[PDB]
Nucleic acid binder design. Structure first.
Length: 288
DNA sequence: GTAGACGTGGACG
DNA sequence: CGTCCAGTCTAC
């Protein structure tokens, strides 16, 4: 999941678990049933702990916890979702981690491919440096300076898929959709964009992230769609208002765009076994 | 730059 | 059966 899904997920985890007391976390299968996550033993030795919040930056999610009788000593759960990571209020297929709160309340993290990660830490300093490895959150920051794009002689699709250079939160489908709406060829070097292209790109980045955030059935978050429609949405990018009510794929994994224009499934970014497919429509997206 | 890896599928032929 | 597609790390 990308920025929008991770953020909505954290909103839901906060609604249900902020102020609750975590009593145990069990890794019942997957990678962490075979090997302990970093810091697990030390964290477990300090349970139970009260959840003070759940927050996100880009695709990175974390819990903040503390003991009411020593409110200064804070604990953190670091979480990345990878490709198939998903939280839920019920024990779904591929459940890897089970969080047990007071009064039989439960949270479950599921992950088919096991690419998601957990780390436990007692260091606010370590988290701060971690957050500093990520660019500003595309969804939650309303004034990122997108003109930094022009300094890089690299394909705009790679610059946007990077989590540090311009901003964090965008992934394979957001980028493709954004570049289609902005009418920009994915190959175009950031250093070749005009100031108008940049302004237009920033408009559409906000438009798409907000649209995805606001959606109730994006796909991945099936395990929370009951909760998604029962919770509100924070007023990110307040001045931008998508017309559609659900996020729709215009080019991603499509053979044609909505107007019948051919969609190319291009392999621009990556090498070896990390190559990604960039969907774009040449008829619409050009170098101008 | 290039290459590989991390489990587990779904869709399709 | 088979093939291809589906966030981020690491090394030469």
């Amino acid at each position: 999941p990308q920025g929008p899904e991770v953020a909505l997920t954290a909103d839901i985890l906060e609604k249900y678990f902020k102020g609750k007391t975590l009593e145990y976390i069990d890794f019942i299968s997957g990678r962490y049933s075979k090997s302990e996550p970093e810091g697990y033993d030390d964290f477990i030795a300090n349970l139970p702990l009260k959840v003070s919040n759940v927050d996100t930056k880009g695709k990175f999610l974390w819990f903040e916890l503390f003991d009411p009788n020593d409110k200064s000593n804070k604990w953190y759960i670091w979480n990345t979702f990878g490709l198939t990571g998903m939280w839920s209020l019920f024990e779904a297929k591929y459940t890897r981690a089970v969080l047990s709160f007071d009064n039989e309340l439960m949270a479950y993290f599921s992950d088919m491919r096991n690419f998601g990660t957990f780390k436990f830490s007692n260091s606010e300093k370590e988290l701060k440096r971690k957050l500093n490895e990520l660019g500003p959150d595309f969804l939650k920051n309303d004034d990122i300076d997108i003109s930094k794009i022009k300094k890089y002689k690299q394909p705009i699709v790679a610059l946007l898929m990077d989590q540090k250079k311009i901003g964090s939160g965008l992934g394979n489908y957001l980028v493709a959709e954004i570049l289609y709406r902005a009418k920009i060829d994915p190959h175009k070097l950031g250093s070749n964009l005009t100031d108008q292209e940049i302004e237009n790109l920033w408009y559409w980045i906000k438009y798409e992230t907000k649209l995805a955030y606001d959606s109730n059935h994006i796909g991945y978050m099936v395990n929370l769609e009951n909760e998604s429609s029962k919770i509100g949405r924070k007023n990110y990018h307040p001045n931008i208002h998508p017309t559609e009510k659900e996020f729709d794929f215009l080019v991603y994994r499509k053979k044609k765009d909505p107007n019948g224009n051919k969609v190319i499934a291009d392999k621009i970014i990556g090498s070896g076994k990390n190559k990604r497919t960039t969907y774009w429509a040449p008829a619409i997206q050009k170098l101008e």
